[PDB]
DNA sequence: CCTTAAGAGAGTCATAGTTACTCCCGCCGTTTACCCGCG
DNA sequence: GGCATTTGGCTAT
RNA sequence: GGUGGACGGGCCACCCUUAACCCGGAAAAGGAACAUGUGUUCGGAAAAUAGCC
DNA sequence: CGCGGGTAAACGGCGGGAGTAACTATGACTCTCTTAAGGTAGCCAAATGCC
């Protein structure tokens, strides 16, 4: 098993080679360097206590007590893992807490009430033989002449009375006749069709559109047509669909661009295997990464339906092609009428390049090969684009030459087990590009002109999952705190785009009141669409897409939804919702993801029934596999859970949700017990860090791939659940320690530079601990700021202003700054207000709200780090820097180790002497090649005379660098001019440059930075130092202007903005000037490097060569 | 060719907050089970 | 005319 | 003590042919699958609606 | 049989005091410190929208 070594040990042997390298610490190192892939772990001797970090048990020992595993005894012991308490209560909370289940059940025990023995001693001496004969009597003898006969004596030993006393118990004037069970049939949703006529004027936009026209020919307008296609559309022809295509067809050959050909520029080793995969790596890290991300953390290369093509084909033929029978949905009505005025204002060429912008940019092509880029490039600014979407508008009419598309299919599951069966791949549907714009802009208007029921979620403007998933946490808290019933439901419609018939869209499309020429259009739109399957490298015949939504048309989603709105709309008309308060919510939504909530098991009984009866009509499907569902009945002083029988959806047995048990639910684990699961963040981070720590991607790479792709991941479900800062502080040691191994930091590297951006300096990685908190405050301002009133009257109501407050304090933000939670929000647009009012809405970019963050956080390790004496001076000089740190974003040119190095020296803990002897007493930190006192960075870089050459060579080739600049710009240099001032002293300017006139004096120094002024004093001492010459330079150059500014660097990398003066004297151009302050930057530090290099061969390198 | 100084985080245990309940006490209100008048 | 302005990720479905 | 295991720290194998390896500041196919020893591939594969950082 | 009206005691439903297991959050302290090579060139971070 594990080997153990147990301490305290000072010199402890390997379990595995048992060599006496050092102290624990060392023989960690040790155990990683040489028995790779081996666990071991350390045990505290005196009290056996493992943990696979040394220094955990190092530090243990000094508080460990003796013996300390001796269990708490008591009489009170668990039954199933045997804990023992020595109180009843102690023993319950425990079965609580660690047996959600037992405690569950006990709570119903408890509930049950079973004492036999509520009457009230009034029972009497009656005999149930007795009362059931009598029952069976009077039944027999229901107020019929000669009504007691045998009722008086049958009864041996009893009076007329006492059969009075017994009705009374059971029938009072009679005997009780068993009869209750509530009916079945409470729906009645399937009658009335509303369809008379056009639900609009069937003009209504034709009528508005041939206005329009008339007035821009009148008026020579700015809206674009082709003339002759309205012309005839105008004229009532009866062959627009030929004309409108063939002009289609000329401008899409505009569009079809010849588009640009690619221009993407023993005998047995395993070495092949290893180069291979590095190769594979780098590459992905140079091209997109994204791709390298996904493989790296999730695992999984790429899947694909190993399904045979003839499968494939057959099941699909038999699904899209196959119709269902549709007949309305009764009184299932959709919220209001549908608004016919966003559709006004025809296509423009400026709405467009709106909706392109908004767009995804590296979409892949559809069957046209007709990419955005290309779209672009043909039409930059999108007047072709405009005639045609508004000749294919006005017509209502969408040419068949560009219905095709091609589909594709998706791993759905992780499971490669489960995606053996096909129902575990998604079908997505791609067409011409040209066809999704412009189903993209219909979509626009459609979603002004619909107006969808609040309580869906998904695919609109509202942040979602945010939402819901509060809302549900609050109501099924607030349900156990205020000893109210609760019956949650989790539901999912089966095939949710790939089930909605075409019918069904086009009778939501109906009475709702949208006009019958975007009924037309949209008809259109999902009219003859041929959708011929590909797989690897074989496609399969075309298919007719004749049920459905295309699964990737920017007008599905909103479809779906219009689709769904009845049923939101009815359930929430139910009112048989969560009794919050005057209002009552009935059913969170999300896209076809659909929880409903309810105040008694019974009113879960009739929001079952209604979304059957929708499921019926509709004829989309929902399994009972997928779906979840829990009860919250209520004790005297807990809470019981799924106290009531299961449901019974569909004629099946809802699968109930019980304590301990989690349902996934928007990525969440939503668990009936404690809401939501707590989620395994610290597991999947440290199998994250173990898989990024494992690959050909070299500690920079490493890292960057951590910050970009890695920790967005864990910030969605650390935020979306209350994540406590203990939590986030763990995770944020464990990161750090992982990232420091990866960058072969030392463990005591100031967290300000791990923590400080790259701009700023620092490594860029993100403190959960202290940005969580900041999303989670932001994201409970947005949910109480929300746009549905529902929510935030739900929120409100639960006191989230406390904890707003709470997370306001806790992410660094101060009490005063506490933004009032009720009001109103900055919105911006990223526009003038002038632009913004000189155009329509539909061309007006989408408003983005702001919502404020309690502290910059960065700013805060900032100027911790800073504080720091030793691992923070002089860092305030590359403060909101942009050109020293822009090494630690773009480090090519740097090898690895150079820019391993490179962050050392930045960040201060380089390890020489200084730094090895720092803090403790009993520690030479005397210099090893030299006599100064302190073997610090700036004596190495500085002053040591043992890299004196290395330094003259770095100043020397920095002073070069210039020069070449100089030689660029047509300057004629002089280099190192011998001058004696009138003192006859040696004084050389670096460099002497020649232009026009004017000369320019300039010397280059290196100096480490310590202090603001330092760079401010290195030009002045040049300043102060040349000055003298001004005569002698004139007769060496016959120059009539001379300067005498110097050209500080910085140690480290510091580009001091006076340089920028100096280069602005030289005439050289902005743009070219920011470019030439970060190449010195970037190669200054190099020479440091160099310089370090040098410096720590000599000595050590000079004794292992020459000893 | 240029500088003075020199912990800092990793880590555990102790103790207090506090979460979400558990236990018990006791009182007031509801239920149960006959009684009486009774046409 | 450069200038300037911006380039990235993730989650849900 | 010398070589081999791409290179370095090990650790192994041979005494030149080379079975397996761990870690790395090193590592851009002597692999896998086609095409018959020599070429290719060895996909950037994947869409949409919203939100969040 | 049906018709009401009275009935009054466990017990259960609830107000509230008293605990409490086990997280969660600081506070008070201690422990840690030599991983592994040598050279050379030092570059890639640009592309793109508007102007
Ligand atoms: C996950 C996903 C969903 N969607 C859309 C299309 C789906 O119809 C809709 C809901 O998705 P899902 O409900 O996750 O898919 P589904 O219900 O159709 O699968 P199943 O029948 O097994 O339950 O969201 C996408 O467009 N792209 C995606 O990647
Ligand atoms: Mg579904
Ligand atoms: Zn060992
Ligand atoms: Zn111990
Ligand atoms: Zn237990
Ligand atoms: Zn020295």
Redesign the pocket.
């Known amino acids: 098993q594990k080997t153990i070594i147990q301490l305290?040990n000072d010199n402890p042997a390997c379990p595995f080679?048992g060599?006496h390298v050092?102290?624990?610490?060392?023989l960690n190192?040790?155990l990683?360097?040489?028995?790779?892939?081996?666990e071991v772990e350390f045990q505290?001797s005196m009290?056996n206590?493992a943990?696979p970090?040394?220094?955990?048990?190092?530090?243990?020992?000094?508080?460990?007590?003796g013996k300390?595993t001796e269990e708490?005894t008591?009489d009170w012991a668990?039954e199933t893992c045997n804990?023992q308490?020595?109180?009843?209560?102690?023993?319950?909370?425990?079965?609580?807490?660690?047996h959600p289940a037992i405690?569950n059940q006990?709570?119903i025990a408890?509930?049950q009430?079973?004492?036999?023995?509520?009457?009230?001693?009034?029972?009497?001496?009656?005999t149930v033989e007795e009362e059931q004969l009598?029952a069976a009597?009077?039944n027999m003898?229901?107020?019929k002449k000669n009504?007691?006969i045998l009722?008086s004596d049958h009864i041996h030993m009893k009076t007329?009375?006492?059969?009075?006393?017994?009705?009374?118990?059971?029938?009072?004037?009679?005997?009780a006749t068993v009869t209750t069970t509530n009916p079945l049939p409470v729906s009645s949703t399937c009658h009335l069709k509303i369809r008379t006529d056009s639900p609009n004027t069937t003009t209504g936009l034709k009528d508005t559109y041939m206005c329009k026209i008339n007035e821009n020919i009148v008026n020579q307008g700015q809206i674009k047509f082709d003339s002759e296609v309205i012309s005839a559309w105008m004229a009532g022809d009866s062959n627009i669909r030929s004309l409108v295509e063939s002009t289609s067809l000329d401008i899409l050959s505009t569009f079809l661009m010849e588009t640009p050909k690619?221009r993407?520029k023993?005998?047995?080793?395993?070495?092949?295997?290893?180069?291979?995969?590095?190769?594979?790596?780098?590459?992905?890290?140079?091209?997109?990464?994204?791709?390298l991300?996904?493989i790296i953390?999730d695992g999984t290369?790429?899947?694909?339906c190993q399904i045979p093509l003839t499968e494939i084909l057959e099941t699909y033929k038999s699904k899209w092609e196959t119709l269902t029978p549709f007949e309305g949905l009764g009184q299932f009505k959709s919220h209001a009428v549908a608004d016919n005025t966003a559709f006004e204002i025809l296509l423009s060429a400026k709405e467009i390049?709106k909706?392109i912008k908004?767009?995804?940019?590296?979409?892949?092509?559809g069957p046209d090969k007709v990419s955005?880029?290309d779209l672009?490039l043909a039409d930059?600014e999108c007047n072709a684009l405009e005639k045609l979407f508004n000749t294919w508008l006005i017509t209502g009419i969408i040419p068949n030459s560009i219905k095709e598309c091609?589909s594709?299919?998706?791993?759905k599951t992780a499971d490669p087990e489960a995606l053996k069966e096909l129902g575990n791949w998604?079908p997505?549907?791609?067409?011409s590009?040209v066809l999704?714009l412009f189903?993209?802009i219909i979509?626009?208007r459609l979603?002004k002109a619909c107006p969808i029921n609040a309580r869906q979620?998904?695919?609109?403007?509202?942040?979602?999952?945010?939402e819901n998933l509060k809302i549900l946490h609050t109501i099924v808290?607030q349900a156990?705190?205020s000893?109210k019933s609760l019956g949650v439901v989790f539901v999912?419609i089966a095939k949710?785009f790939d089930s909605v018939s075409h019918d069904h869209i086009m009778w939501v499309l109906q009475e709702r009141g949208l006009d019958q020429h975007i009924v037309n259009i949209i008809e259109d739109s999902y009219k003859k669409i041929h959708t011929r399957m590909?797989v690897?490298?074989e496609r399969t015949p075309p298919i007719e897409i004749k049920v459905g939504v295309?699964?990737?048309?920017?007008?599905?989603?909103?479809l779906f939804?219009l689709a769904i709105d009845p049923l939101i709309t009815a359930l929430e008309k139910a009112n048989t919702g969560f009794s919050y308060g005057k209002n009552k919510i009935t059913s969170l939504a999300?896209?076809?993801?659909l929880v409903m909530l309810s105040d008694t098991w019974e009113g879960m009984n009739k929001n079952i029934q209604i979304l059957e009866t929708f499921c019926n009509l509709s004829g989309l499907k929902v399994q009972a596999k997928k779906c979840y569902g829990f009860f919250l009945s209520?004790?005297?002083?807990?809470?019981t859970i799924n106290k009531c029988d299961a449901w019974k959806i569909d004629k099946d047995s809802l699968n109930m949700i019980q304590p301990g048990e989690s349902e996934?639910?928007?990525?969440?684990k939503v668990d009936p017990?404690?809401?939501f699961s707590?989620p395994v963040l610290a597991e999947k981070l440290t199998i994250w860090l173990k898989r990024l720590?494992?690959?050909?991607?070299?500690?920079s790479?490493?890292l960057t791939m951590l910050n970009?792709?890695?920790?967005?991941?864990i910030?969605?479900?650390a935020?979306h659940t209350d994540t406590?800062?203990?939590?986030?502080?763990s995770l944020d040691?464990?990161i750090?320690?992982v990232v420091?191994?990866?960058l072969?930091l030392?463990?005591?590297?100031?967290?300000?530079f791990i923590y400080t951006k790259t701009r700023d300096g620092g490594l860029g990685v993100?403190r959960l601990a202290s940005?969580i908190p900041?999303?989670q405050a932001?994201?409970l301002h947005?949910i109480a700021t929300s746009e549905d009133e529902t929510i935030r009257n739900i929120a409100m109501a639960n006191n989230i202003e406390e904890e707003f407050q709470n997370l306001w304090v806790?992410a660094g933000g101060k009490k005063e700054e506490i933004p009032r939670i009720t009001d109103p929000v900055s919105i911006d647009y990223?526009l003038p207000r002038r632009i913004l009012e000189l155009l329509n809405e539909w061309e007006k970019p989408?408003p983005?709200?702001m919502?404020p963050?309690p502290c910059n956080w960065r700013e805060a390790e900032m100027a911790?780090?800073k504080?720091?004496?030793?691992?923070?001076?002089?860092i305030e000089h590359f403060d909101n820097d942009t050109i020293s740190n822009?090494?630690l974003?773009?480090?090519?040119?740097?090898?690895?180790?150079?820019?391993?190095?490179g962050?050392?020296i930045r960040a201060?803990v380089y390890?020489t002497?200084?730094?090895?002897?720092?803090?403790?007493?009993n520690?030479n930190?005397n210099c090893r090649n030299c006599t100064?006192?302190?073997?610090?960075?700036?004596?190495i870089?500085?002053?040591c005379?043992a890299v004196?050459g290395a330094?003259?060579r770095?100043?020397?080739?920095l002073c070069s660098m210039l020069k070449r600049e100089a030689k660029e710009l047509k300057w004629v240099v002089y280099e190192?001019p011998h001058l004696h001032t009138t003192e006859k002293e040696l004084r050389?300017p670096?460099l002497i440059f020649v232009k026009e006139e004017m000369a320019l004096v300039v010397?280059?120094?290196?100096?480490?930075?310590?202090?603001e002024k330092?760079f401010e004093d290195?030009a002045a001492?040049k300043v102060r130092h040349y000055k003298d010459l001004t005569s002698q330079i004139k007769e060496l150059t016959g120059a009539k202007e001379i300067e005498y500014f110097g050209f500080?660097?910085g140690?480290r990398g510091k580009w001091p903005e006076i340089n920028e003066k100096v280069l602005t004297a030289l005439g050289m151009?902005?743009?070219q000037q920011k470019?030439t302050a970060?190449?010195?930057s970037?190669?200054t530090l190099?020479?440091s490097?160099?310089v370090i290099?040098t410096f720590?061969?000599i000595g050590?390198?000079n004794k292992?060569?020459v000893p």
Request: with cysteine; aromatic share 8%; proline share 7%.
């Open positions: 305290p080679c060599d050092g102290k624990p610490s060392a190192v040790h990683k360097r040489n028995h790779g892939g081996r505290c009290c206590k943990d970090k040394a220094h955990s048990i190092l530090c243990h020992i000094p508080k460990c007590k300390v708490p008591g668990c804990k308490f020595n109180t009843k209560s102690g023993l319950s909370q425990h079965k609580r807490i660690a405690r006990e709570r408890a509930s009430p079973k004492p036999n023995s509520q009457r009230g001693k009034h029972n009497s001496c009656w009598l009597f009077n003898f229901w107020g009504i007691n009722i007329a009375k006492q059969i009075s006393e017994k009705r009374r118990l059971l029938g009072l004037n009679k005997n690619p993407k023993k005998w047995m080793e395993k070495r092949a295997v290893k180069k291979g995969f590095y190769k594979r790596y780098q590459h992905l890290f140079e091209t997109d990464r994204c791709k991300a996904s953390l290369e790429r899947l694909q390049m909706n908004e767009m995804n940019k590296n979409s892949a092509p955005l880029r672009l930059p091609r594709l299919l998706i791993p998604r997505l549907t791609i067409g590009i999704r189903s993209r979509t626009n979603a979620r998904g695919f609109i403007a509202t942040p979602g999952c945010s808290k156990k705190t000893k999912d949710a590909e690897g490298t295309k699964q990737g048309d920017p007008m599905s989603p909103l939804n999300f896209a076809d993801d209520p004790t005297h002083d807990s809470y996934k639910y928007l990525g969440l017990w404690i809401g707590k720590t494992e690959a050909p991607l070299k500690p790479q490493k970009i792709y890695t920790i967005p991941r910030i969605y479900l935020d406590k800062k203990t939590l986030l502080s040691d464990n750090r320690t420091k191994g990866w072969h030392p463990p005591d590297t100031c967290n300000g993100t940005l900041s999303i932001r994201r947005r806790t990223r989408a983005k709200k919502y963050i911790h780090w504080n720091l004496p030793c691992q923070g001076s002089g822009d090494w974003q773009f480090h090519r040119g740097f090898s690895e180790r150079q820019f391993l190095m962050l050392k201060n390890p002497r200084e730094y090895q002897g720092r803090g403790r007493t520690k930190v100064a006192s302190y073997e610090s960075l700036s004596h870089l500085g002053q005379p004196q330094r003259i770095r100043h020397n080739k190192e050389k670096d010397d280059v120094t290196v100096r480490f930075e310590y202090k330092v290195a001492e500080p660097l140690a151009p902005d743009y470019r970060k190449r010195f970037k190669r190099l020479y490097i160099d290099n720590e061969n050590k390198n292992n060569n």
